[PDB]
Design a protein around this ligand. Structure first.
Ligand SMILES: Cc1cc2nc3c(=O)[nH]c(=O)nc-3n(C[C@H](O)[C@H](O)[C@H](O)COP(=O)(O)O)c2cc1C
Length: 182
């Protein structure tokens, strides 16, 4: 019913809180309430033509899920449920949570798997983010000096999250038809 679907994966609530912060900025007409992918219905997920998806990186640079030692199923188990769906015509923006100090070689790698998955199915992906403001040495989520989606780090750069969400949401505002609060 809402224009933008908002889904996330999360083990310790960090990504969930961010998803909520994002929703707090827009009206029910433009964006739906944040929902954990382990609660989502395929038909419910497939209805939106615009999607904002968030995910942390766990285990060993993996998507959250039971194989990554998450307390509950997450993106890992959800993707197969929609692997046969076509995402052509759908606009998707990704945000990832990670810890650049503790995992300098796999910073927000989960973003790559998410991007690859929807990209391989015709989705229009937007929201690349400059990688200069981060300290890391390697990442599957970096292409041409930019992260495949917004990168957030509540472990080391929590103070930067507000300006990053304002700036990033403004970046995908054109594609998504969003209007940021003053
Ligand atoms: C066992 C474990 C592994 C992690 N692996 C990575 C990693 O590979 N890359 C990364 O950027 N962050 C990694 N992190 C950091 C988390 O993604 C980060 O703390 C995030 O904020 C957690 O999100 P959540 O609270 O939504 O689960 C790891 C954290 C833990 C506890």
């Amino acid at each position: 019913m809402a224009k933008i679907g908002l889904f996330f994966g999360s083990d310790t609530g960090t990504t969930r809180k961010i998803a909520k912060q994002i929703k707090d900025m827009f009206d029910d007409e433009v964006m739906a309430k944040p929902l954990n992918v382990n609660r989502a219905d395929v038909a419910d997920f497939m209805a939106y033509d615009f999607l904002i998806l968030g995910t942390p990186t766990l285990g060993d640079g993996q998507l959250p899920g039971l194989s990554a030692n998450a307390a509950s199923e997450s993106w890992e188990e959800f993707l197969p449920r929609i692997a046969d769906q076509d995402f052509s015509g759908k606009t998707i923006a990704l945000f990832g949570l990670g810890d650049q100090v503790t995992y300098p070689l796999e910073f927000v790698n989960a973003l790559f798997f998410l991007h690859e998955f929807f990209s391989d199915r015709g989705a229009n992906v937007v929201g690349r983010w400059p990688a200069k403001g981060y300290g890391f040495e390697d990442s599957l989520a970096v292409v041409e000096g930019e992260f495949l989606g917004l990168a957030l780090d509540q472990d080391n750069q929590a103070a930067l999250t507000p300006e990053r969400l304002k700036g990033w949401l403004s970046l995908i505002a054109a594609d998504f038809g969003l209007v940021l609060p003053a």
